[PDB]
């Protein structure tokens, strides 16, 4: 492992991919249900019993509710995770009406 921080297989497109999919997929909110969470977690480490998986995302997801900070923190460290979503969902076009960059932002001012 290298000291890559939050920069890995994340280009403009990739970060946009990870946020856009994760959120919109599960709830559409700033968080995700167990379902999208499972896809991510099983992505790198499979064979987890729910007890083992729940402790995986314990702390910030608590039980159910992976939020964009928690989710992003995990994915930004795992290239299989970043691309995992990138593979499932192409990067948003970001030209119609982007909050900021829809990738590495803090204040998602969305048109809703």
Automatic annotation (TrEMBL):
Origin superkingdom: Eukaryota
Protein name (Swiss-Prot/TrEMBL): Uncharacterized protein
Organism per entry: Trypanosoma cruzi (strain CL Brener)
